[PDB]
Design a protein that fits this description.
The structure holds 2 protein chains of 2 kinds. Chain A is about 0% helix and about 0% strand. Chain A contains no helices and no strands. Chain B is mainly β. Chain B has one domain: Roll (PH-domain like), CATH 2.30.29.30. In chain B, about 15% of the residues lie in helices and about 45% in strands. Chain B contains 1 helix and 7 strands, in the order βββββββα. In chain B, strands 1, 2, 3, 4, 5, 6 and 7 form a 7-stranded antiparallel beta sheet that branches. In chain B, a hairpin with a 4-residue loop joins β6 and β7. Chain B is globular. The two termini of chain B are about 15 Å apart. The relative contact order of chain B is 0.23. Classes of the chains: A little secondary structure, B mainly beta. At the A-B interface, loops of A face loops of B. The PDB classes it as signaling protein. The entry lists the keywords protein-ligand complex, polyproline recognition, beta turn, signaling protein.
């Protein structure tokens, strides 16, 4: 899962 | 050429699951045709660091993981780059150019 908030 | 802004990350080398921030803020990322090597390249400079120095190969792929995050494996750099954008719009133009410059 992508780094937040991306 | 083509330039845009994005926060840079690289997958962690140990487990290749987690993302490690490469830049501390958004940085310029550009697609550039290197007339000395006759290849298309993706580069991003931050200070004295070349945080991205990827040569586009026909067997390379850009994945739009989410609305504002895309990624691509670079076997030469032995890593996977991840880019976070300010909008899905920017993520999209980046992805379309990846395919365009790859197709040539």
């Amino acid at each position: 899962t992508p780094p937040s908030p991306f | 050429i083509f330039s845009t802004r994005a926060h840079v990350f690289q997958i962690d080398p140990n487990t290749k699951k987690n993302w490690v921030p490469t830049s501390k803020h958004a940085v310029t990322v550009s697609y550039f045709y290197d007339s000395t090597r006759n290849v298309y390249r993706i580069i991003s400079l931050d200070g004295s660091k070349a945080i991205i120095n990827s040569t586009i190969t026909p067997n390379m792929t850009f994945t739009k993981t989410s609305q504002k995050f895309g990624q691509w494996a670079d076997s030469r750099a032995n890593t996977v780059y991840g880019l976070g954008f300010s909008s899905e719009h920017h993520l999209s133009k980046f992805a379309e150019k990846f395919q365009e410059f790859k197709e040539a």
